[PDB]
Design a binder for this molecule. Structure first.
Ligand SMILES: Nc1ncnc2c1ncn2[C@@H]1O[C@H](COP(=O)(O)OP(=O)(O)NP(=O)(O)O)[C@@H](O)[C@H]1O
Ligand SMILES: Nc1ncnc2c1ncn2[C@@H]1O[C@H](COP(=O)(O)OP(=O)(O)NP(=O)(O)O)[C@@H](O)[C@H]1O
Ligand SMILES: [Mg+2]
Ligand SMILES: [Mg+2]
Lengths: 275, 312
């Protein structure tokens, strides 16, 4: 396949929803409700532009129950991304704003489906680079939908033929090797696996990590230094011992100790049965 | 307060216009123009239709739980008590359409961050006048209210055509500071080395930020890392390595040939890494550089309008 490009006059851009680490979302219409994220790189270079078209080729070939559908892009008014529109609130809204109250049965299930979709992405060798509760939606309060995955080339604006990831995103989910931005490609499967483990800390505590550190740069420095770690004492009393141990493996400071998603997902379904 | 007469006139005059303002409503404003943005908000110049007053309006979109948000709005109401000529005038703070509006007085000069762009570098004669304002501003906050800024940087120092210099967006709401802590990475940091490894150590840690800001505005360049050998006679690091440079590398300094010794010394005492050894407000007030720059009669107002493009 090739031209995945939507023309102008086809996307009824609607209300402004919000901005994130690399775009601004509007609820657009396009054969039904879609989500149009106006990228921050509005003026792209034909070297960056062709890498984007190459990465859209992989994202367009993704079909999983736990993955948000990627419906192509546009280059009319300005470079934009068209994805599935999600009803309901994101996981971040449920856990930290609405304070929706789930049982452990439901919480583990959310964690199971998230590993389900994440394992698909790694099976197709796609690094999410942005896994966080903000990019996880509960579709009709049932199915988990992971979004904002991949798209490495529209983050970290290029120079001409270079994409040094000027690290961006939210720091709370960034692995320590991602924080340092030091060796070639900090973003890896284990960098995602760590971010996943932070999502577990969210589900199992109801809190964000480092609830007592209210300094953005203090977290960036101490985490990248190996001084600061998510305080696992904050886990709810009714959390399975098998879950708190899996959580601790994904948060290993050195990335080579963290497990991969085939092993993670197997552990979650096991403790879902012995519950 | 320890002020003169052109200040007691301007101070009391603000409290008058502040009274012509009752309940603040989103519908009582007409948008004029934008003034600036930052990672975590945007500011507009607006007009209060129920009284014609022109104000700045910072809108903070925060995805926070309502219990926390109602605490933030409650905590922000302290800004009504801060009435100093070195603290930006404040009109009110409220919540609407999922956004927190902080309504403050309009400063047609802007932040020293934007002024630094139009100027390139800022003369030491002027930075002396700025240092006096920031030192008195942190003093008023520390003495009359026991609150500290925690974000002294060029973008939070505001100026205007009447030649005033004022601090703003200091940490009055502790809940607001913790909500902003889940923001995306920046590109630079004015955080003192102790705050990166631990927590605030009294007013000394705000002094480091003032010092690092003076060095940037003096040389027209963020000074971490220090300028190159021939970049300097011409007179990008990762966010982590900047923080790592602050914590483990010798503090930045001014060049030896271009600035006075009192100034080089004034910013050196401001940038000592140990917060206890670092100078405090009592010492900086009577420093040689401040003693001199307080005596001089520089035309700050005329220098500003010239630097931007305003009429005399
Ligand atoms: N597919 C979607 N459908 C509906 N709302 C969405 C969708 N994607 C994002 N949003 C919302 O749009 C707003 C901004 O999203 P976004 O730009 O993705 O920032 P973010 O998710 O918070 N961080 P990031 O995804 O890493 O950039 C948030 O309120 C999201 O909940
Ligand atoms: N009262 C005011 N009058 C005029 N300009 C203002 C006023 N308050 C803020 N601004 C401008 O608005 C810009 C952005 O505001 P602000 O929300 O403080 O972002 P910032 O301080 O520059 N960076 P950050 O605080 O980290 O988000 C500033 O750089 C100022 O130029
Ligand atoms: Mg998202
Ligand atoms: Mg500010």
């Amino acid at each position: 396949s090739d031209d995945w490009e939507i023309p102008d006059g086809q996307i009824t851009v609607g209300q402004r929803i919000g901005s994130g680490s690399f775009g601004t979302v509007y609820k657009g219409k396009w054969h039904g409700d879609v989500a149009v994220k106006m990228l921050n790189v509005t003026a792209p270079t034909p070297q960056q532009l062709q890498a984007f078209k190459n990465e859209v080729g992989v994202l367009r070939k993704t079909r999983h129950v736990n993955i948000l559908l990627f419906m192509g892009y546009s280059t009319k008014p300005q470079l934009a991304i068209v994805t599935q529109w999600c009803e309901g609130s994101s996981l971040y809204h449920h856990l930290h704003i609405i304070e929706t109250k789930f049982e452990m049965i439901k919480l583990i299930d959310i964690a199971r489906q998230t590993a389900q979709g994440m394992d698909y992405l790694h099976a197709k060798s796609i690094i999410h680079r942005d896994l966080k509760s903000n990019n996880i939606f509960l579709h009709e309060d049932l199915t988990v939908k992971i979004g904002d995955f991949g798209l490495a080339t529209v983050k970290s604006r290029w120079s001409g033929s270079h994409q040094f990831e000027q690290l961006s995103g939210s720091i709370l989910w960034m692995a320590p090797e991602v924080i340092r931005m030091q060796d070639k490609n900090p973003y890896s499967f284990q960098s995602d696996v760590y971010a996943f483990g932070i999502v577990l800390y969210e589900l199992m505590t109801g809190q964000l990590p480092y609830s007592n550190i209210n300094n953005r740069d203090q977290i960036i420095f101490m985490v990248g230094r190996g001084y600061l770690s998510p305080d696992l004492s904050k886990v709810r009393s009714n959390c399975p011992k098998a879950m708190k141990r899996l959580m601790a493996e994904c948060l290993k400071k050195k990335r080579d100790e963290r497990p991969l998603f085939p092993q993670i997902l197997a552990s979650i379904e096991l403790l879902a049965r012995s519950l | 307060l320890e002020l003169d007469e052109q200040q007691r006139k301007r101070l009391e005059a603000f409290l008058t216009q502040k009274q012509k303002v009752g309940e603040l409503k989103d519908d009582d404003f007409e948008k004029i123009s934008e003034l600036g943005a930052g990672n975590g908000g945007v500011v507009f110049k607006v007009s209060h239709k129920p009284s014609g007053l022109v104000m700045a309006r910072k809108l903070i979109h925060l995805e926070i739980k309502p219990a926390i948000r109602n605490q933030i709005i409650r905590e922000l109401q302290v800004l009504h008590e801060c009435n100093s000529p070195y603290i930006v005038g404040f009109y009110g703070a409220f919540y609407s359409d999922g956004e927190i509006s902080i309504c403050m007085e309009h400063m047609d000069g802007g932040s020293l961050d934007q002024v630094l762009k139009k100027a390139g570098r800022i003369p030491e004669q002027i930075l002396g006048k700025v240092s006096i304002a920031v030192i008195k501003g942190l003093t008023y906050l520390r003495e009359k209210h026991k609150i500290m800024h925690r974000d002294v940087k060029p973008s939070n120092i505001l100026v205007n055509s009447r030649g005033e210099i004022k601090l703003c967006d200091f940490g009055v709401s502790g809940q607001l500071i913790d909500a902003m802590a889940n923001a995306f990475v920046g590109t630079r940091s004015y955080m003192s080395p102790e705050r990166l490894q631990g927590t605030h150590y009294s007013v000394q840690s705000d002094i480091w930020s003032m010092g690092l800001s003076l060095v940037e505005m003096a040389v027209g360049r963020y000074p971490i890392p220090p300028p190159d050998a021939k970049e300097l006679e011409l007179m990008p690091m990762a966010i982590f390595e900047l923080l790592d440079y602050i914590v483990n590398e010798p503090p930045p300094k001014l060049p030896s040939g271009v600035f006075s010794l009192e100034f080089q010394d004034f910013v050196n005492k401001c940038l000592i890494k140990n917060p206890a050894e670092r100078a405090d407000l009592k010492q900086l007030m009577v420093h040689a550089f401040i003693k001199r720059s307080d005596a001089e009669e520089v035309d700050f107002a005329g220098w500003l309008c010239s630097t931007i493009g305003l009429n005399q």
